[PDB]
Design a protein around this ligand. Structure first.
Ligand SMILES: Nc1ncnc2c1ncn2[C@@H]1O[C@H](COP(=O)(O)OP(=O)(O)NP(=O)(O)O)[C@@H](O)[C@H]1O
Lengths: 538, 66, 48
DNA sequence: TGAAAGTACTTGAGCTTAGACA
């Protein structure tokens, strides 16, 4: 079997024999394209390249790391990015446009710097695999500078089979991966279990801790490590705090600098700074074999992000704890954040129920943090796995009693300055009342013959066209009652009279209930004039 | 006001840290957080600390050295 | 034009016509006492 | 059995993120 070349490459070119897991071996023999698309979930290993091929890695750090690693592994691999040298880019474009692994970022994949090159490599059929690297939900996430490919790459690249690579494969996430990437059915599922016994998963509540700084300092003392503070310069704050408490910690707010991080990262690689704090960053740097803790000071966004950032610990298998510091205030703040994000998102794009997929992802995180049971069991349930049968190494596994008491205490822990306080309280307590999928607009246009000037107007929110028609009919009945009390001309002019009255009320109104109140106020005036026996003038 | 926010000493050497000084009656406490914890700051220690302040560094502090 | 300048206010949110409610959040703030807070805030800081 | 007020201190909080181009 070419498996002979696989063995030779592993022995000499790779430095292995693919024996860490037989599952990845079966995946490698699956990528020989005896099947209709293979869905492998990169876990504690890789086997691509063998299984010119374009590498779709969204972040250039992985592009560099991998191409230099393969070059040191005696492999001729090329990379294409904008930050690359102009002369190097020109010579690479020259030697690729005419006569074995290409690493590119999607920014120029659909741009003029590579699209003619893409067509040249497609028409000449020089491509054998269109593989997207760390194809995590990365696909279905972010600025989305890539369809995913739909037929704009999966098909635009008729050949180049196309293989997927995501750390987290939950049922909905993986089926949406297939739907977006247009992976041809039946996609060969090669999914590794997410259970890991080397991580002591636990959750500590900041409110219950008298001094969270001291508790987290004690945690990192009993252990490299990457604590995760959300954002808002709180990363720098926490780094200084720990440095004050005796933990040499640095920061990685995206608002720093490639320079700032360039060293900030390598310092950490060689244990110059044992602890490094990142906001949501550090999608790379995952080769340390130590990572003794990835405790999250702030809650993550979903099981996808949490699991991806937390599995980086214990690469060699040694225990690495990893915690999550939870705050109800943080929970509702991030809930506000995502809700306003999707509210502005619908204002610029379509329905895209993935917007709500995000909100129940966050709710799944919240309920996992606030549930009672094995954390490994919860992550397996979210990822579709089975019972982990994990021994001590959980909050519930090690001591069920203490966690229950802590949760019970947390339940009882609920209870011009007040203006912001009341505003926050009201908004957070009624925002949650709206529930999931808060899009619900479905603006109905005027059907065929609405007697409504500027009927297609969105000035008054939640004012249906049918409601305005109902108010117009009520005004029409009022005018007809006035007609059979004062003997006006006819109904043909009364129709326009009612239309004009409704339009005047609409212009004078700003919100729906006020508009209805004004409509009802006119109706009485009319009836009153009919009782006054006088015609209802202007 | 400017210096009460600088918890670290860099400029110059001495990259070590700064404790919080808290007054309880007649005693000053060098309250190191964890870098024992509440070491009593004896007046001998503060006298030794003050003795090494340069004339320029006390002039900027506002107190004329002479 | 009545006998009691009466005003009625509700707290309409429902759920935009979705499926019931499963595992509601702990701090739901039941509408009765949420209406308590709403009425108190209106009676105290409305600045009409 | 019932000041009153002005000033100098602390202490906590705390607020989006993502890579490319730029
Ligand atoms: N069969 C194997 N035998 C030996 N070493 C292997 C094997 N498979 C993978 N490895 C090594 O394990 C490393 C980790 O791969 P992988 O877990 O995909 O990377 P990661 O960035 O640490 N985690 P991930 O999020 O899944 O990408 C690879 O780079 C290989 O060096």
């Amino acid at each position: 079997d070419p498996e002979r070349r696989v063995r030779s490459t592993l022995k000499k070119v790779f430095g292995f024999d693919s024996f860490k897991t037989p599952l990845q071996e079966s995946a490698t023999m699956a990528v020989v394209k005896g099947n209709k698309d293979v869905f492998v979930c990169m876990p504690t290993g890789a086997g691509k390249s063998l299984c010119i091929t374009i590498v779709v890695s969204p972040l250039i750090a992985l592009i560099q790391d991998q191409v230099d690693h393969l070059l040191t592994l005696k492999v001729r691999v090329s990379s294409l990015n904008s930050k690359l040298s102009a002369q190097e880019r020109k010579e690479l474009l020259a030697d690729l446009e005419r006569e074995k692994i290409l690493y590119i970022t999607p920014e120029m994949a659909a741009s003029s710097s590579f699209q003619p090159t893409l067509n040249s490599l497609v028409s000449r059929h020089l491509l054998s695999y269109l593989v997207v690297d760390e194809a995590h939900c990365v696909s279905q996430w972010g600025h989305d500078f890539r369809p995913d490919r739909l037929g704009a790459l999966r098909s635009r690249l008729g050949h180049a089979p196309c293989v997927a690579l995501t750390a987290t494969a939950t049922p909905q996430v993986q089926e949406d991966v297939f739907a977006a990437l247009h992976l041809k059915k039946p996609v060969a599922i090669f999914k590794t279990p997410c259970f890991r016994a080397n991580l002591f998963y636990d959750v500590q509540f900041k409110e219950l801790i008298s001094d969270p700084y001291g508790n987290l300092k004690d945690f990192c003392l009993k252990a490299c490590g990457i604590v995760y503070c959300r954002t808002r310069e709180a990363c720098e704050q926490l780094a200084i705090e720990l440095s004050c408490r005796g933990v040499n910690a640095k920061a990685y707010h995206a608002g720093l600098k490639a320079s700032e991080r360039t060293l900030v990262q390598n310092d950490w690689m060689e244990e110059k700074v044992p602890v490094i704090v990142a906001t949501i960053s550090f999608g790379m740097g995952v080769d340390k074999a130590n990572v003794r803790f990835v405790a999250h000071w702030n809650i993550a966004k979903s099981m996808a992000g949490y699991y991806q950032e937390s599995g980086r610990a214990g690469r060699d298998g040694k225990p690495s704890w990893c915690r999550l510091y939870y705050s109800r205030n943080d929970r509702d703040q991030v809930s506000f954040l995502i809700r306003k994000e999707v509210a502005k998102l619908q204002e610029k794009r379509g329905n895209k129920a993935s917007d709500k997929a995000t909100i129940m992802a966050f709710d799944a995180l919240v309920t996992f943090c606030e549930e009672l049971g094995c954390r490994h069991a919860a992550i397996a349930k979210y990822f579709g796995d089975a019972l982990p049968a994990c021994a001590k190494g959980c909050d519930h596994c090690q001591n069920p009693t203490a966690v229950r008491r802590r949760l019970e205490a947390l339940e009882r822990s609920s209870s011009e300055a007040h203006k912001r306080e009341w505003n926050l309280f009201y908004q957070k307590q009624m925002q949650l009342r709206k529930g999931k999928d808060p899009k619900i607009e479905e603006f109905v246009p005027p059907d065929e013959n609405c007697p409504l000037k500027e009927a297609s107007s969105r000035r008054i929110p939640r004012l249906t066209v049918k409601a305005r028609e109902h108010c117009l009919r009520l005004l029409e009945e009022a005018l007809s009652s006035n007609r059979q009390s004062t003997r006006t001309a006819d109904e043909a002019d009364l129709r326009a009279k009612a239309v004009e009255l409704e339009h005047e009320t609409f212009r004078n109104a700003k919100v729906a209930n006020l508009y209805k109140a004004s409509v009802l106020k006119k109706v009485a005036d009319i009836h009153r004039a009919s009782k006054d026996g006088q015609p209802y003038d202007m | 006001d400017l210096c009460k926010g600088k918890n670290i000493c860099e400029h110059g050497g001495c990259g070590r840290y700064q404790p919080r000084i808290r007054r309880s009656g007649l005693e000053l406490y060098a309250e190191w957080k964890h870098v024992e914890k509440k070491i009593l700051l004896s007046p001998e220690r503060v006298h030794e600390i003050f003795k090494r302040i340069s004339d320029e560094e006390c002039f900027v502090l506002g107190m004329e050295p002479r | 034009n009545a006998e009691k300048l009466v005003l009625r206010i509700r707290i309409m949110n429902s759920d935009e016509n979705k499926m019931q409610e499963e595992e509601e959040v702990v701090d739901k703030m039941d509408d009765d006492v949420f209406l308590r807070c709403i009425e108190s805030n209106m009676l105290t800081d409305m600045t009409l």
